[PDB]
Scaffold this active site. Structure first.
Site, PDB file in Angstrom:
ATOM      1  N   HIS A  28       0.836  -1.245   0.000  1.00  0.00           N
ATOM      2  CA  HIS A  28       0.000   0.000   0.000  1.00  0.00           C
ATOM      3  C   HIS A  28       0.855   1.274   0.000  1.00  0.00           C
ATOM      4  O   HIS A  28       0.273   2.287  -0.215  1.00  0.00           O
ATOM      5  CB  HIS A  28      -1.105  -0.019   1.073  1.00  0.00           C
ATOM      6  N   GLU A  52       0.054  -7.754   1.256  1.00  0.00           N
ATOM      7  CA  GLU A  52       0.712  -6.517   1.730  1.00  0.00           C
ATOM      8  C   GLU A  52       2.240  -6.618   1.664  1.00  0.00           C
ATOM      9  O   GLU A  52       2.864  -5.606   2.009  1.00  0.00           O
ATOM     10  CB  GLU A  52       0.180  -6.114   3.117  1.00  0.00           C
ATOM     11  N   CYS A 137       4.759   2.473   7.862  1.00  0.00           N
ATOM     12  CA  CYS A 137       4.514   1.219   7.092  1.00  0.00           C
ATOM     13  C   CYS A 137       5.686   0.994   6.105  1.00  0.00           C
ATOM     14  O   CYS A 137       6.203   1.985   5.489  1.00  0.00           O
ATOM     15  CB  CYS A 137       3.160   1.250   6.378  1.00  0.00           C
TER      16      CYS A 137
END
Ligand code: YI6
Lengths: 171, 172
Positions: A28, A52, A137
């Site tokens: 993402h 992911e 992230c």
């Protein structure tokens, strides 16, 4: 010579150089409009996506200063990893995480699949230097085993409370 | 940790020290250059020095750091407090290492006798090395924590075990 030099700003988060030609990140955070990364045309980059977790393989050496590291599909349950967080402030924030089972959860809004863990800073951050934020992230999960650093995935999500984290893993 | 705390962390001797106020500087006794007779342009004769084992406080007779506000220095912290140790490393990198604080202890570390507030790093499982743990050049770095409204300083880095897991904060 440092693990920390491998952690690089990328897209809306971070990624990690496993070797001179291999870069891992959280799916993402990757730019959705691009013709090149790190000066190499996308033409010449192999992309391997599993939920992911995303791995890039470059056709030439981007980081020839680095040796190749061990990459595994998560770690044994109970392993205490470090998440190697870099902040735009200039802070380096290694946080201990007790790793658990592979699982699916609706961390805040959405459903996420990966290796669950619990932060070991406890009580509460109130004070960003004990917990994750959305901008973290892609940060790598690592641990020392025998004489070697093992990388076992990347930071995908963390619950509202901040307690549970998800480490996206290879295959 | 806020910029105003990092601005107080000063290279000194073989390690670091920390400005509590425009006139008060704290450090680890063993990092002090023992031949030194002048600090920040002031003679020894113009500085009040308070030493308790591995904790040293310097009080100057003029404002050395007038950019700073005076903050709270406490004699260690409650057991279970999580501190950050404000460590500067090669290249404007800032390493605020998380540590869970425990009891005041006397220990033998690398053969030396040391006394202060024990703690255990919250950075990883083993911490033996510069990536997740302390190195001897880190001594004098401050132990800080956040309360509801403010930040407190409660001691300076004095030692760490060979394993890296346990650290000691010298206290006033
Ligand atoms: C070897 C790892 O063993 C453990 C590590 C951390 C805890 C504490 C917690 O999970 O909050 C309990 C057991």
């Amino acid at each position: 010579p440092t693990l920390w030099s491998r952690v690089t700003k990328f897209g809306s988060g971070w990624g990690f150089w496993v070797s001179p030609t291999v870069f891992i990140t959280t799916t993402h955070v990757i730019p959705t409009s691009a013709k090149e990364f790190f000066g190499e045309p996308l033409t010449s980059i192999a992309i391997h996506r599993a939920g992911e977790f995303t791995l890039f393989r470059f056709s030439k050496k981007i980081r020839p200063d680095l040796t190749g590291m061990i990459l595994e599909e998560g770690c044994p349950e109970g392993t205490v990893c470090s998440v190697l967080i870099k902040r735009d402030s200039g802070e380096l924030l290694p946080l201990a995480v007790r790793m658990g089972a592979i699982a699916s959860m609706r961390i805040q809004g959405r459903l996420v699949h990966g290796q669950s863990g619990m932060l070991l800073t406890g009580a509460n951050a109130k004070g960003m230097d004990l917990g994750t934020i959305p901008g973290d992230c892609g940060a790598p999960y690592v641990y020392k085993r025998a004489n070697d650093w093992v990388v076992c995935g990347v930071h995908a999500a963390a619950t509202k409370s901040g307690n549970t984290v998800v480490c996206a893993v290879q295959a």
